[PDB]
Amino acid sequence: STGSATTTPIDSLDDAYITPVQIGTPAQTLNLDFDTGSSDLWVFSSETTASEVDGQTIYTPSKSTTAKLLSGATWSISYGDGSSSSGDVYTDTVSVGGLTVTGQAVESAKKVSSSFTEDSTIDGLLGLAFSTLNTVSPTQQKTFFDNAKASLDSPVFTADLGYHAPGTYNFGFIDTTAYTGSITYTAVSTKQGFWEWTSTGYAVGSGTFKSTSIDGIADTGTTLLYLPATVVSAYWAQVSGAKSSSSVGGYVFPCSATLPSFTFGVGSARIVIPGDYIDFGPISTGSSSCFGGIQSSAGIGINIFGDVALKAAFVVFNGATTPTLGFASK
C-alpha cells in the first residue's frame, strides 16, 4: 500500500504545516501537525477541557463505531518549546492520504497547554519519530508509520515541505518526479529516538564550504534551524545590523536586509537554503526588526534541522531495519 497527502502551511510564515487525517468511523477529519521529532498521535477531543479549546476541530470517540478505550492507558508529553498536553487513549482507524491503519493509538487530550489552545489551526500532532519515544503508559504504543510499515510497498515516508506553499507527505514510495538530481542517503542513529544524523558542514552565501561534522535531528515539527553558536554567528555576521537579542530570544536583523543563503552538507552533496527562507518577519506587528530563521542550539542540547532546512529538500525517512535519511534538492 501507499498514501499521499498534501501538507499546508498554517500561516504566511510557514510556522508549521497541517495535514488532514481521517480518524474513526464515520471519518472525523482533523488537521494534524506531522512531527518527525516526536512519537505520539494526539488530538483535541470531546474530552479536552472546554476552556482550552478555541476553534480546533475535535475528535469525539463516542461517535466512532470503531473507537475502543485502551483501558488504563494515559499519556503526557512536553515539547522542546515548553508546550505540553496529556490525556487518555483510544484505538481507532486512522487514514492518511488513502493509507489506513486499524487499531492505531489515538491519544485524546484532556489538557493542553496555552500555546496549543491559542493555535486554532492545529488539531493535534502525528508523531513520526521512533516508537521508543511514545509516552503512553503503562504500555507504550506504536506510531502510525510503525503500524503501517509492514503493509507499505517500501518502508519509507517522504517529506516535501513547501516554501509559502503546500507540499506533500508520501508513505510507502519515493516520487521520483518530486526532486532534482539524486537522493544522497546518510546514516541515522536511533539511540535518542530521533532521526538523528550528521551533516558534513556548511557554507554562508557564496562563501567557502566548511567541512565539519554537525550532529542533529531532522524535525518537521520544529519551525527553525538550530545550529551551534559558532555556525550561527558566522551566518549572521554576513547580515549588516543583525545581532543576538536576549530580550527577543535570538538573532534579529533589519527587515530591510537581503539575507544570504545557507548551505548544509549531506555527505558530499549540498542543500541550499535560500536567504528568503530564513526571514521570519517582524518580531511584533509593525516592527522593522525581523526574526531570524537560523538560531543557536546552545541552550537546547541538540542541533535541529527544522522546517527552514527541510523545506529546501526532498527528504526520505527510510524505516528499513537499519534506518537512513535521504536528501535531494528540488
UniProtKB/Swiss-Prot annotation:
Annotated GO biological process: proteolysis
Residue ranges annotated for the Peptidase A1 domain, each copy included: 17-328
UniProt KW keywords: Aspartyl protease, Disulfide bond, Hydrolase, Protease, Signal, Zymogen
Keyword Protease carried by entry: yes
Enzyme class: hydrolase
EC number(s) reported in the record: 3.4.23.22
Disulfide-linked positions: 255-290
Active site positions, chain numbering: 35, 199
Record's catalysed reaction(s): Hydrolysis of proteins with specificity similar to that of pepsin A, prefers hydrophobic residues at P1 and P1', but does not cleave 14-Ala-|-Leu-15 in the B chain of insulin or Z-Glu-Tyr. Clots milk
Gene Ontology molecular function, alphabetical: aspartic-type endopeptidase activity
Superkingdom, natural source: Eukaryota
UniProt family annotation: Belongs to the peptidase A1 family.
Name of the molecule in the record: Endothiapepsin
Record organism: Cryphonectria parasitica (Chestnut blight fungus)
Residues of the full protein shown: 90 to 419 of 419
